[PDB]
Design a protein around this ligand. Structure first.
Ligand SMILES: C[C@H]1SC(N)=N[C@](C)(c2cc(NC(=O)c3cnc(OCF)cn3)ccc2F)[C@H]1F
Length: 379
């Protein structure tokens, strides 16, 4: 129940292009690389020869393909996909030894969806039915997986920060992927992986904001987002505090707003000048919280694709949000994250693969006594 050597290192990717798992669709099996995405609920795959695609789902080749005779148009704030809904046989070669009949959205037109130069051709939406397109009757993949097999209602993600990697442990926890203890936060509601942030610290210095701001209008765990995204006010106070803590060196305003990169000579990054960032999360027990702490090496992420610079260039990967807090790859790269769906909870433990230096490490610590944690949730 605690060692899944088969599924260790089943995630690949490129920096800033996300984390993908190999998947097969149809009979005979068609291999596809699929973005692992805890911030959506559709299993959506390229099904037409978009020029950026390495491969695509060819329904005509699958004898087990069934048509639901229903389309879906999915817009985002920037970009879209449109698909045809059907079902087919789906398996995960480096996952559990099973085959599932799952909903597939066959992507027939898209815009700013696929990444030019990326090595994935679809998205595996791991969140719940409530946010599935077009509605909650379109059963997400993981629900079908759990319903149809004896795979436990749990998956865990170790996201390791040009090549990235890690593990998606399907049906369990691999103890070699973390150090110390897992600490669990409740899933507030089963739509996104919603959580409640209870306290925020920059280098141990509390932001002293009304904790309702931290979760305005929600906080989510999202492997499909690069940044730690913060509500506008929280971002402002956080940046003011990060500025103060790092005032040893001055940086342009546009860097903090993600409008410019900032570059240093190779190996000459002042990591120690930048603060740690701590998020206190609601614990399992009344008045009990725990704290997750990330490093500058999580939120100041390298931009390798700069043709106009011979130096080491970085993006400030904490940005403002109007959809609430998004604990993206910036958070998740620090931690082994257990999506304990059976128990409506998310476990955090320090990642065995997280990027750190000789002085500071990412941390998961508790218990702490935090009162009025329920007031932090926005209604
Ligand atoms: C608005 C988005 S947010 C979300 N969770 N999921 C959706 C389906 C979505 C996500 C993405 N992700 C990425 O490209 C990406 C890149 N780098 C990452 O980490 C560092 F490597 C993580 N993810 C691409 C297209 C998408 F459509 C959309 F809903």
């Amino acid at each position: 129940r605690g060692s899944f050597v088969e599924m260790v290192d089943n995630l690949r990717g490129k920096s800033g292009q996300g984390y993908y798992v190999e998947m097969t669709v149809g009979s005979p099996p068609q291999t596809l690389n699929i973005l692992v995405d805890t911030g959506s609920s559709n299993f959506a795959v390229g099904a037409a020869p978009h020029p950026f695609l390495h491969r695509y789902y060819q329904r005509q080749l699958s004898s087990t393909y069934r048509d639901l005779r229903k389309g879906v148009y999915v817009p985002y704030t920037q970009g879209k996909w449109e698909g045809e809904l059907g079902t087919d046989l789906v398996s995960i070669p480096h996952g559990p030894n099973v085959t599932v009949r799952a909903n597939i959205a066959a992507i027939t037109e898209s815009d700013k969806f696929f990444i030019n130069g990326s090595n994935w051709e679809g998205i595996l939406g791991l969140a719940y039915a409530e946010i599935a397109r077009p509605d909650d009757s379109l059963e997400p993949f993981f629900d079908s997986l759990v319903k149809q097999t004896h795979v436990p209602n749990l998956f865990s993600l170790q996201l390791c920060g040009a090549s990235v990697g890690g593990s998606m442990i399907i049906g369990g926890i691999d103890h070699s992927l973390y150090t110390g203890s897992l600490w669990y936060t409740p899933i507030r509601r089963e739509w996104y992986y919603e959580v409640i942030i209870v306290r925020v610290e920059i280098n141990g210095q509390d932001l002293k904001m009304d904790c309702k701001e931290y979760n305005y209008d929600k906080s989510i765990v999202d492997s499909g987002t690069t940044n730690l995204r913060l509500p506008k006010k929280v971002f402002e106070a956080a940046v003011k505090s990060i500025k103060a803590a790092s005032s040893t060196e001055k940086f342009p305003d546009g860097f903090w707003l993600g409008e410019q990169l900032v570059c240093w000579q190779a190996g000459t990054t002042p990591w120690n000048i930048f603060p740690v960032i701590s998020l206190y999360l609601m614990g399992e027990v009344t008045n009990q919280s725990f704290r997750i702490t990330i490093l500058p090496q999580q939120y100041l992420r390298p931009v390798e694709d700069v043709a106009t610079s011979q130096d080491d260039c970085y993006k400030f990967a904490i940005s403002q949000s109007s959809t609430g807090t998004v604990m993206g790859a910036v958070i998740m790269e620090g931690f082994y994250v257990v999506f304990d769906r059976a128990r409506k909870r998310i476990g955090f433990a320090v990642s065995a693969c997280h990027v750190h230096d000789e002085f500071r490490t990412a941390a998961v610590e508790g218990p702490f006594v935090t009162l009025d944690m329920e007031d932090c949730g926005y209604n």
